[PDB]
């Protein structure tokens, strides 16, 4: 047990191992039953709603790629040469996840769109082949 | 400009008999006509509004049908309380005379 | 239950002016159920010629709309109350003639105690008692 | 054989109502000066609007049964009410005024419109009194029976002075549906406001809907595209307002020639009442000018489009508002924080059988009851300097008269009052639908 | 790319192909961090909560039928003769989805209930057979 | 049909059969479009947010164990002797679910943690074997 | 009063205490607060010892 | 005799719409709603 964000400076392998620790603390915090319009209750309601919607957006992004409920999901889109092409051993043994995000920050959106298209296409293919 | 015309002027009938009288218009007024009841010495009271819809208080014996230019008002199972004067109404236009139901 | 009460019968002379009041009460306070939403039509009933429409007054801003035959000689004013559940409607006919003798009715368009009939202004249920104006010499 | 196949994200919507939040351009508001319609609180709109055309889509629209206009009316009322909450309450200002007419350099047009009223108003110390004077318009003071006067709205409502820094300038606001809801925009150039719309588009936000409050004229508004459009709930019904839309500008240039000066009077511990102290220069009547040829034309287009509904052999006549309050019998609008009530009798007064400018005299009021709220009024503070406006008459709110039984003429007098009709001319093309992305369809598939 | 609701008037096949475009824009809109009690912030909070709960209801309806994370899901309940029995080619080549919803608008609830029962029954069957 | 919580006093087998009835009524209640700051609208907004976040927490707990969208899910963690060791027939024929919760109330958290660890480990194993 | 020509005086409630009470500012779920444990921190630049609270 | 002294006809001076003018009005207050100050003076 390394705690929340414990493997932030660790290797991407260890972070992939401990993903569940970060996954648990994404929706529930320390946040009595009644709602008040003082400053603190107001901010509390705002924080609850913000956490709910952010977690739901992340979950929707997972689900529409056909990876709902999976911490590690395998997809069908290859890696283009435009995206980072550094060695597998170096990425998975000599990196932290923060550096990897900093490196491929741009490109996120096109990768997501390719994931959407591939998921929809394979859904159509599965529906067509299952009808036989 | 609508020339509402209601006929006949009077309609004598017996108790329980059904009566009918029409309010002929000049142009197309769809179903925007209303029917009223003017008892002698009393204020007018609405009978049928929007052509076919029935007023809540009055029984279902009062029925009004029609679409376009010619509209029909029917009073089935006449009773001594229905003896009054009736007239149609399309927006601000009223018939010149109206129909007066009397007892045979 | 909106009730409309008018003024007493008046006997005038040709060239005079008559002002018939119309007290309305029981409309309600909530928007769409208040006196500032339901027009007060003024209907003239000449004995023999049937009913005649003279004009309507919308009590929110006093927007009036007179019939063509009466333009220039009829004026409508309001006295909408504070709670807007009641009010008073006036009509002045400033050029009375011998053919203007009739019974004048003020009417509204609220059939039911729980319906918003603001936009249906021609279901004239709440007729007033009737002010018998007699214009003769 | 057939088996149920559930599809998520189908392009299916149903008619429904929802809460439409606000979005506005950052550059629209100065970011330094507040607004009566709060624009800072609105989310920043996207620089590039995302309008998606829908082909083969016919949807039934109804501008007269649209919840968008009612929601906007409620929003504007709430904004106006909450803008006046922190402002000064002018309850001490109801005193007995010793008013005398201003006869210093006044033209005959405004001989008695202005009254120099001297009264006694509490200072910061409640045990000491102050004798101050102010210039009140005739419409803002009613005589009590020099003479004795009082505010016109002092036996019916409590006066709350509008905050001098809060601007009344209309700023465009985009009404955006929440996620899961879509706003359908009708791109048909000849849309009567009711019935199917062959060209239906989908937007996430509406266009820039300027909350311009006005009567008898739609100022600074959205135009028609092909022709002048006459749109009414029921053109046969004379009780329904007739909304007209102009395809070309009708520029109206307002001005307030008096150079008013604002004098701050301390009416309490920290409260200041701004009064019209003096006017530097000549006294002239406020007026609005409308090009004569441009109007007479625009009226020609209007009568040409109006003759369609009533027949080609009717004598269409326009006339001036008969009866009503000042908010209906005159063109009421707001020009730079000062409220104008202009006699639009010259604009109308015309009969249409089958360089010059029109000057409309205007009257200024400071005690304003905008939404006819019971027990609530507003005192518009004086605006320093000369006020000028250049607005566009983009529409009309007409009203047919009535029981012309055999007469061939049809008279159309102006008149507004209901601001919901004013804001219906902007939301006629918009419609809110609720996305139902879950659907079941039959296929030959079989779950394992 | 046809945009949001782009294939509304298109054939049900094209709409089934482009489902993902409508699926993306169901939770996130144009809707700074702080919460205010002016009219606009109030309406903004209401809109956020409404979108969140509607998306969650749709996702729950998908999940309890065993179709979570799937845009096109195959089920085990047949089509009764009471429900619309028009030809497969006509439905999938001559229809829009709006017309199809208008046609079967009433039989929705019973179809949903049959889906619930079938999903629960096959969950029990899978649990029983997996114990062997 | 036994209704919401109909099989509360019924055998755990019947409750496992009727799980879907309780599952349906966890997010949507009887809870017009506009938001008001009176007491009732305030409490209504609080109730909506509370229901949303509670359902989302339950769904997240289901998903991070690799059981998203499944009413009955089979896992890989055995039962320790510390936890209740009563007979299978007695548990599944002579019990209600309330009694079973009362019996194993404590222990919930460690069972959940074992589920997290097993799910993450088998995700890693599946990703590793699928790369071959 | 000194503040009587500029502001309106509101008397503080005698039962409301002005005693400072510690308050912990907590981030919502999905947000983390990074605490810099460096004992010589100039307030700007990298922090070698970063903790999460 | 049951309600001999329960009702009190109280006349007082109340501000009108103009704060510089006063109004003399009267009202009927129940005995439980008024307390004497030491016709007599009540509040
Ligand atoms: C423009 O002008 C037209 C014509 O006047 C208006 O259309 C009418 O609108 C009224 C309501 O405002 C409609 O009246 C209602 O009719 C119902 C029955 O209608 C059905 O059956 C008739 C049979 O001939 C059909 O023609 C019609 O299409 C319908 O299928 C009644 O059930 C209603 O009564 C109930 O509602 C009213 C109102 O709340 C209550 O007061 C009653 O107590 C009752 O609960 C009602 O009478 C009328 O039918 C419409 N005529 C049509 C559609 O041609 C337009 O509304 C008006 N404005 C617009 C926007 O176009
Ligand atoms: C719509 O157009 C019509 C026709 O132009 C217009 O009618 C006219 O209105 C004016 C103003 O209301 C009337 O003028 C008044 O007439 C009365 C007698 O009937 C006079 O006593 C009035 O005197 C004024 O001037 C005096 C001296 O300065 C003042 O002491 C006094 O208070 C008045 O201000 C004044 O002349 C005019 O008679 C009618 N004539 C018609 C019917 O043609 C109508 O007002 C317009 N409606 C609007 C503007 O909404
Ligand atoms: C709204 O605008 C209307 C149009 O401008 C205004 O109508 C005018 O109102 C004034 C009073 O405010 C009337 O004035 C009187 O008119 C009579 C008639 O004389 C006229 O003709 C003679 C020559 O025959 C001429 O010398 C006069 O100057 C007049 O033009 C005079 O005898 C009176 O002294 C007085 O001037 C106007 O007649 C009237 N015009 C019309 C076309 O009716 C209306 O008052 C405005 N009202 C508002 C602001 O609500
Ligand atoms: C608040 O104060 C105003 C001003 O005093 C009141 O307005 C005045 O109300 C009276 C009726 O109480 C009006 O009298 C009538 O005027 C017409 C004018 O044509 C006349 O024909 C009648 O014989 C009668 O005298 C008066 O005109 C009106 N004044 C104005 C300037 O509108 C108002 O009623 C008061 N409101 C309340 C709540 O009492
Ligand atoms: C219709 O829209 C026009 C703009 O397209 C509005 O005109 C503008 O009105 C504002 C407010 O009166 C003017 O602002 C003021 O300008 C003066 C001089 O620069 C300045 O001293 C004031 O502090 C204030 O900023 C603005 O100049 C004016 N623009 C034009 C083109 O004249 C008009 O008021 C709108 N009409 C409505 C909403 O009825
Ligand atoms: C609110 O009331 C206070 C107290 O009367 C005002 O403060 C006073 O403001 C005057 C402004 O001229 C100050 O006068 C100047 O004082 C300096 C002192 O060195 C002197 O050199 C100048 O010749 C002149 O006399 C006065 O000192 C000051 N009194 C204080 C601060 O106790 C205040 O300005 C008022 N605020 C307003 C008018 O909104
Ligand atoms: C921070 O980086 C150091 C250096 O890479 C990590 O320490 C090494 O970790 C690996 C894997 O456990 C060991 O095999 C090495 O022996 C460690 N250091 C040496 C001396 O080579 C360290 O673990 C990283 N931080 C965390 C929290 O994992
Ligand atoms: C300001 O207050 C003074 C004092 O009340 C007003 O002047 C007095 O008004 C009364 C009215 O009945 C007269 O009897 C006094 O003779 C007046 N003068 C005094 C007492 O010095 C004055 O009019 C008020 N200011 C206004 C209303 O302009
Ligand atoms: C008055 O109307 C004209 C014409 O509609 C407006 O001018 C247009 O403004 C838009 C936005 O800046 C431009 O895209 C158009 O090209 C302009 N048209 C012309 C012919 O100049 C003008 O802004 C309006 N004035 C207002 C609303 O105050
Ligand atoms: C509106 O039009 C009037 C004329 O109908 C203009 O009046 C003239 O204005 C100039 C410049 O101030 C003066 O020199 C003239 O003497 C005025 N003529 C009259 C008859 O008064 C007025 O300035 C115009 N103003 C606007 C706002 O357009
Ligand atoms: C309004 O009335 C006041 C008087 O009540 C005028 O002020 C006086 O004006 C004369 C002549 O300029 C001065 O001698 C006095 O000292 C002024 N008294 C003051 C300022 O209290 C004022 O000028 C009038 N305003 C207008 C525009 O007519
Ligand atoms: C309204 O005001 C505008 C200016 O704000 C006037 O427009 C100018 O008018 C002059 C004189 O005709 C022309 O030479 C200019 O080219 C116009 N352009 C500008 C400066 O905008 C307009 O004429 C005025 N018209 C009315 C109806 O008063
Ligand atoms: C309206 O009156 C004001 C006040 O006199 C004028 O502005 C002043 O002008 C003089 C120069 O003539 C300057 O010295 C002052 O500083 C100005 N005072 C201010 C800006 O408050 C103004 O110019 C007059 N009319 C207009 C609109 O020009
Ligand atoms: C709207 O309907 C038309 C007619 O069905 C569609 O156009 C046809 O689309 C198919 C499929 O792409 C083509 O094979 C045909 O050649 C097209 N034309 C005809 C005459 O059939 C059109 O695509 C539909 N709208 C959208 C946005 O898809
Ligand atoms: C409550 O318990 C009873 C049993 O005590 C359940 O009903 C049946 O009762 C008979 C009694 O002879 C038993 O033989 C049956 O085995 C019981 N179960 C069944 C499935 O028939 C009863 O169903 C329980 N309550 C609920 C809500 O199910
Ligand atoms: C209402 O106000 C009047 C005027 O202030 C009061 O009358 C005065 O009361 C004092 C009490 O000490 C007497 O000394 C005066 O002689 C009274 N003046 C008169 C009668 O004009 C009166 O008492 C107040 N209260 C009521 C209800 O009358
Ligand atoms: C102001 O004008 C009105 C106009 O009716 C007049 O009655 C009044 O006496 C005038 N006041 C003064 C002092 O000039
Ligand atoms: C409105 O326009 C549509 C066509 O867009 C037409 O079918 C309908 O009859 C028109 N009706 C009215 C009320 O103008
Ligand atoms: C306005 O134009 C019409 C023709 O469209 C013309 O008859 C009329 O005389 C013109 N202006 C006026 C009011 O004279
Ligand atoms: C089902 O819905 C369709 C919609 O067009 C309707 O025509 C039909 O009468 C409905 N019938 C039943 C059985 O609910
Ligand atoms: C602050 O300290 C860091 C080292 O911790 C150093 O890199 C940076 O330049 C310093 N800058 C300032 C503003 O003192």
UniProtKB/TrEMBL annotation, chains A, E, F:
Glycosylation sites per record: 80, 87, 106
Chain spans, region Fusion peptide: 1-14
Subcellular location: Virion membrane; Host cell membrane; Host endosome membrane
Gene behind this protein: env
Region Immunosuppression, annotated ranges: 43-61
Coiled-coil regions, chain positions: 102-132
Domain Retroviral envelope protein GP41-like: 12-132
Disulfide pairings: 67-73
Membrane topology category: Single-pass type I membrane protein
Name recorded for this polypeptide: Transmembrane protein gp41
Taxonomic classification: Viruses, Riboviria, Pararnavirae, Artverviricota, Revtraviricetes
Transmembrane annotation, as ranges: 1-17
From TrEMBL, chain G:
Glycosylation sites: 5, 42
Disulfide bridge partners, by residue number: 36-47
Places the protein is found: Host cell membrane; Host endosome membrane; Virion membrane
PTM annotation, UniProt: Highly glycosylated by host. The high number of glycan on the protein is reffered to as 'glycan shield' because it contributes to hide protein sequence from adaptive immune system. Palmitoylation of the transmembrane protein and of Env polyprotein (prior to its proteolytic cleavage) is essential for their association with host cell membrane lipid rafts. Palmitoylation is therefore required for envelope trafficking to classical lipid rafts, but not for viral replication.
Domain of life assignment: Viruses
Recorded domain comment: The CD4-binding region is targeted by the antibody b12.
Family, as annotated: Belongs to the HIV-1 env protein family.
Subunit-structure text: The mature envelope protein (Env) consists of a homotrimer of non-covalently associated gp120-gp41 heterodimers. The resulting complex protrudes from the virus surface as a spike. There seems to be as few as 10 spikes on the average virion. Surface protein gp120 interacts with host CD4, CCR5 and CXCR4. Gp120 also interacts with the C-type lectins CD209/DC-SIGN and CLEC4M/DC-SIGNR (collectively referred to as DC-SIGN(R)). Gp120 and gp41 interact with GalCer.
Additional observations: HIV-1 lineages are divided in three main groups, M (for Major), O (for Outlier), and N (for New, or Non-M, Non-O). The vast majority of strains found worldwide belong to the group M. Group O seems to be endemic to and largely confined to Cameroon and neighboring countries in West Central Africa, where these viruses represent a small minority of HIV-1 strains. The group N is represented by a limited number of isolates from Cameroonian persons. The group M is further subdivided in 9 clades or subtypes (A to D, F to H, J and K).
Protein name: Envelope glycoprotein gp160
UniProtKB/TrEMBL annotation, chain H:
Positions bearing carbohydrate: 9, 13, 38-39
Post-translational modification: Highly glycosylated by host. The high number of glycan on the protein is reffered to as 'glycan shield' because it contributes to hide protein sequence from adaptive immune system.
Subcellular localization(s) per the UniProt record: Host cell membrane; Host endosome membrane; Virion membrane
Additional record remark: HIV-1 lineages are divided in three main groups, M (for Major), O (for Outlier), and N (for New, or Non-M, Non-O). The vast majority of strains found worldwide belong to the group M. Group O seems to be endemic to and largely confined to Cameroon and neighboring countries in West Central Africa, where these viruses represent a small minority of HIV-1 strains. The group N is represented by a limited number of isolates from Cameroonian persons. The group M is further subdivided in 9 clades or subtypes (A to D, F to H, J and K).
Domain notes: The CD4-binding region is targeted by the antibody b12.
Family listed: Belongs to the HIV-1 env protein family.
Subunit structure: The mature envelope protein (Env) consists of a homotrimer of non-covalently associated gp120-gp41 heterodimers. The resulting complex protrudes from the virus surface as a spike. There seems to be as few as 10 spikes on the average virion. Surface protein gp120 interacts with host CD4, CCR5 and CXCR4. Gp120 also interacts with the C-type lectins CD209/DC-SIGN and CLEC4M/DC-SIGNR (collectively referred to as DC-SIGN(R)). Gp120 and gp41 interact with GalCer.
Protein name in the entry: Envelope glycoprotein gp160
Record lineage: Viruses, Riboviria, Pararnavirae, Artverviricota, Revtraviricetes
Gene that produces this protein: env
Full-sequence range covered: 139 to 191 of 860
